[PDB]
């Protein structure tokens, strides 16, 4: 019944960063601990000095900046996968699924949710990092060497249009719930039940969009297509991951992420 508020509360409880918090920082109102702007080699070094001094003490600047940024991005994804798992466990019905089916839903779902949610911490000029205390510019990322400069640019492009829909956290929580509870993931066994789980979530999303955005009459099918865009975005991103597996020596993938990427 009241599936939407349980989903919204699960979202509010399990994600350290969200859109309300992110927009405070991106608008420019974070006066106490404002986001350090990382826009070149030198501001990246200052940021690392202040935010991860244990790492600079261990000679981490003796690695290329691309490798350092890669590692930061890696750790954030690992963190978010953990939050997504706890989020999913709180979606009504999820905890009753077969363990292997739960693994399947997360494996194929986490990165669609990550890049959806990544939009919240993005603006036209850059993205928040380090729990809102850093802001790495879009142009600095483009200025890195191949293939690292190729990773974030399509996410910025997705985020710009997604953000033009002006969703709030209540919308995004249901959106991410629909991404995770997807009945067409390869290898699902209880397809019938997961399909009914998604039918309920998509139903409440539709109702919620109608009352939370009464002006945008076509927002629901727009969001449905954004779901398909994200699957395309992830399939394209997986091949960038593949280029790094093969042709980058000092860019070791975290074990949890290679398990996720093993068969996509």
């Amino acid at each position: 019944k009241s599936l939407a508020k349980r989903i919204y509360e699960a979202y509010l409880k399990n994600f350290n960063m969200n859109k309300v918090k992110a927009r405070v920082i991106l608008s420019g109102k974070a006066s106490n601990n404002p986001p350090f702007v990382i826009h070149d080699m030198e501001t990246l070094c200052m940021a690392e000095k202040t935010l991860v001094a244990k790492l600079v003490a261990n000679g981490i600047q003796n690695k290329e900046a691309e490798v350092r940024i890669f590692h930061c991005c890696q750790c954030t994804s690992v963190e978010t996968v953990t939050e997504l798992t706890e989020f999913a466990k709180a979606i009504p019905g999820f905890a009753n699924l077969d363990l292997n089916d739960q693994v399947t839903l997360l494996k194929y779902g986490v990165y669609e949710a990550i890049f959806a949610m990544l939009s919240s911490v993005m603006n036209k000029d850059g993205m928040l990092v380090a729990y809102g205390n850093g802001f790495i510019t879009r142009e600095f990322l483009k200025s890195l060497r191949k293939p690292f400069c190729d990773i974030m640019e399509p996410k910025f492009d997705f985020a710009m249009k997604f953000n033009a829909l002006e969703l709030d956290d209540s919308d995004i929580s249901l959106f991410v719930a629909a991404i995770i509870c997807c009945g067409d993931r390869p290898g699902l066994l209880n397809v019938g039940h997961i399909e009914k789980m998604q039918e309920g979530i998509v139903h409440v999303l539709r109702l919620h969009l109608q009352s939370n955005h009464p002006d945008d009459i076509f927002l629901f099918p727009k969001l449905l297509q954004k779901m398909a865009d994200l699957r395309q975005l992830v399939t394209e991103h997986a091949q960038l991951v593949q280029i790094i597996k093969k042709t980058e020596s000092d860019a070791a993938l975290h074990p949890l992420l290679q398990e996720i990427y093993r068969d996509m």
């Binding site: 798992t85 363990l99 693994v103 949890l256 398990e259």
Partner: peptide, 11 residues
């Protein structure tokens, strides 16, 4: 076991 299973079986 696999790392995703562990996250799902955690307390």
């Amino acid at each position: 076991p696999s790392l995703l299973k562990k996250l799902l079986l955690a307390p």
